[PDB]
């Protein structure tokens, strides 16, 4: 039935918690009906959207308002919440109902008088009724029943109040807060709201994230409130924690220009990184003499090395395995080698052990990723054994990314002479732990370590991120070869040298950048952050204020 | 001095928040960020006291 529009002003407030407070002003962030909002009136079953929550009110009796339905598109496929107001009680049920909402026959049967359901078994709550009548016209003439319906996470909450009002076909002023009449732990998805009039009028509004300053009197009753998003004066009250503001100028907030658009720019690289030559090399060096391969001037798709079968580990250090695809790198290396398999932990940046100390060490910072896969085949052949392991070093803690294959004599201190027995001659050991197709540590885990050096120097390896155009003269969210930031881009007209990629100011912050495709130099000017203060003549004089940026 | 302190990198992998958020995941970035907040807050408190 036909709509109309009005406003609330003094409604939408409810007790946000189950806590008793008195004689205080309490600031809370929750879903509330904004004080000045457009409330839609309907004549008195239209289906309305359900967003964060719904404000409902109507000066009508239970003989018309027989209940409400909340849920997703109503069907037998998903559960819906049916709230019905009976003569002496309220019955609430959740189920895959097609209908079930009749409760009164007349003529309107085309979408009614049907009772289809499934395995309800979901919070069939019953209580005293939501709607209580008055002694005819011995009250204030009609009773505006108010409800708030919330759906947060596992709970559907109902707040309400009665408080009879002076007769008017509109919403009242004054002030009243609603109480949590019902609190139901229902894991239900609600996207649509429908009334049950079985056909006056009713009002519907929507809740929004707002911070309110609530005033509790001596009896712990909310008697008033301030909506912080209503205006500069309300904002001032909320920052000062007072419903009265003295004459003067106050600092309340911070102005900020939003970027709106975004810019993504990378070097025009069409080459792909030769990861196949690393991970599918089939020829893996021993850790004793690990193979260092450099990757450059290519696009690095790392997701294919992560979202892939057969890998036993993919441990990233200093970087996320799901974000590295959006990063630019310089001088990327891939260290390829074979270890016993139970030694995987020894190639972590900070662990100890013969591998960590003598064969292959990573630096404390090590930005990079350690990737390994079982591959028992090819390497662990029966009768085979091809994996040198360095055991005796003389010194200790070789060095990060260092390699030692001199194969000398481990003087044990037994005597300063050249020999084998008692001299521990031969730094590696021939008895490689191959134990073909048996035991533990039978040489599974081919290892590739990706070392990601992150310099401000020109990117040579970039992920598979599509570039876009420039905007200029507007505050934007930009990314120039990984140089992420926000600001206004303009031509710099600066004398950059041929080898310089970007510049910095006296504070050593990025001042300008070179565009990777056009090679032009753009200045980066931070967008306005201003600062907002409010000039108040005194609330005992006027509620008019001026705003200074 | 107050400005220079922004580049201190107080035990974090980077002095720049954007280079942490774009690099590490949620629970990881929080650790690096807490280090920068602690240091920057201490630097600012020192400034105000002076």
């Amino acid at each position: 039935l036909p709509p109309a529009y009005t406003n609330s002003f003094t409604r939408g407030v409810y007790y946000p918690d189950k806590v008793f407070r008195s004689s205080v002003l309490h600031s809370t962030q929750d879903l509330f009906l904004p004080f000045f909002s457009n409330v839609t009136w309907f004549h008195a079953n239209p289906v309305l959207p359900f967003n964060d929550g719904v404000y409902f009110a109507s000066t009508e009796k239970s003989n018309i308002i027989r209940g409400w339905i909340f849920g997703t598109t109503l069907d037998s496929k998903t559960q819906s919440l049916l709230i019905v107001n009976n003569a002496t009680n309220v019955v609430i049920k959740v189920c895959e109902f097609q209908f079930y909402h009749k409760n009164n026959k007349s003529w309107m049967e085309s979408e009614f008088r049907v009772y289809s359901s499934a395995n309800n078994c979901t919070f069939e709550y019953v209580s005293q009724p939501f709607l209580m009548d008055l002694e005819g016209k011995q009250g204030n003439f009609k009773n505006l029943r108010e409800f708030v319906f919330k759906n947060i996470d596992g709970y559907f909450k109902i707040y309400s109040k009665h408080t009879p009002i002076n007769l008017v076909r509109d919403l009242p002023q004054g002030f009243s807060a609603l109480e949590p009449l019902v609190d139901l732990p229902i894991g239900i998805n609600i996207t649509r709201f429908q009334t049950l009039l079985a056909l006056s009028g009713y009002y519907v509004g929507y809740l929004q994230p707002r911070t309110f300053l609530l005033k509790y009197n001596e009896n712990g009753t909310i008697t008033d409130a301030v909506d912080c998003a209503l205006d500069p004066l309300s904002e001032t009250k909320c920052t000062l924690k007072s419903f009265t503001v003295e004459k003067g100028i106050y600092q309340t907030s911070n102005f900020r220009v939003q970027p709106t658009e975004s810019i993504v720019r990378f070097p025009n690289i069409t080459n792909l990184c030769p990861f196949g030559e690393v991970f599918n090399a089939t020829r893996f060096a021993s850790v004793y003499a690990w193979n260092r391969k450099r990757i450059s001037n290519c696009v690095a798709d790392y997701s294919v090395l992560y979202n892939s079968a057969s890998f036993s580990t993919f441990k990233c250090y200093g970087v996320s395995p799901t974000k590295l695809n959006d990063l630019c790198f310089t001088n990327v290396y891939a260290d390829s080698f074979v270890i016993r398999g139970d030694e995987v932990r020894q190639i972590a940046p900070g662990q100890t052990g013969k591998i960590a100390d003598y064969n292959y060490k990573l630096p404390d910072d090590f930005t990079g990723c350690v990737i390994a896969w079982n591959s028992n085949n090819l390497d662990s052949k029966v009768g085979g054994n091809y994996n040198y392991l360095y055991r005796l070093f003389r010194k200790s803690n070789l060095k990060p990314f260092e390699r030692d294959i001199s194969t000398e004599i481990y003087q044990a201190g037994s005597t300063p002479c050249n020999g084998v027995k008692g001299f521990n001659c031969y730094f590696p050991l021939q008895p490689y732990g191959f134990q073909p197709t048996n035991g533990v540590g039978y040489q599974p885990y081919r290892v590739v370590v990706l070392s990601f050096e992150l310099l401000h120097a020109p990117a040579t390896v970039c992920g598979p991120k599509k570039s876009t155009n420039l905007v200029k003269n507007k505050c934007v969210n930009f990314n120039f070869n990984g140089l992420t930031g926000t600001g206004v881009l303009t031509e710099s007209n600066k004398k950059f040298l041929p080898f310089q990629q970007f510049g910095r100011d006296i504070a050593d912050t990025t001042d300008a950048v070179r565009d990777p495709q056009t090679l032009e130099i753009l200045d980066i000017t931070p967008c306005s952050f201003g600062g907002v203060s409010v000039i108040t003549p005194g609330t005992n004089t006027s509620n008019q204020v001026a705003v200074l940026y | 001095t107050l400005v220079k302190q922004l580049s201190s990198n107080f035990g974090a992998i980077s002095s720049v928040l954007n280079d942490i958020l774009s690099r590490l995941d949620k629970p990881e970035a929080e650790v690096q960020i807490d280090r920068l907040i602690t240091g920057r807050l201490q630097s600012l408190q020192t400034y105000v006291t002076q």
Binding site: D505, I506, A507, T509, P526, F529, G531 | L2, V3, L6
Partner: peptide, 24 residues
């Protein structure tokens, strides 16, 4: 333009990165 004395003019002439920082 500035209603300053000769001495005041000498005094004024002689004496000589918005990261959330501002000056009022």
């Amino acid at each position: 333009p500035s209603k300053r004395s000769f001495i005041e003019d000498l005094l004024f002439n002689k004496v000589t990165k918005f990261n959330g920082l501002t000056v009022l």
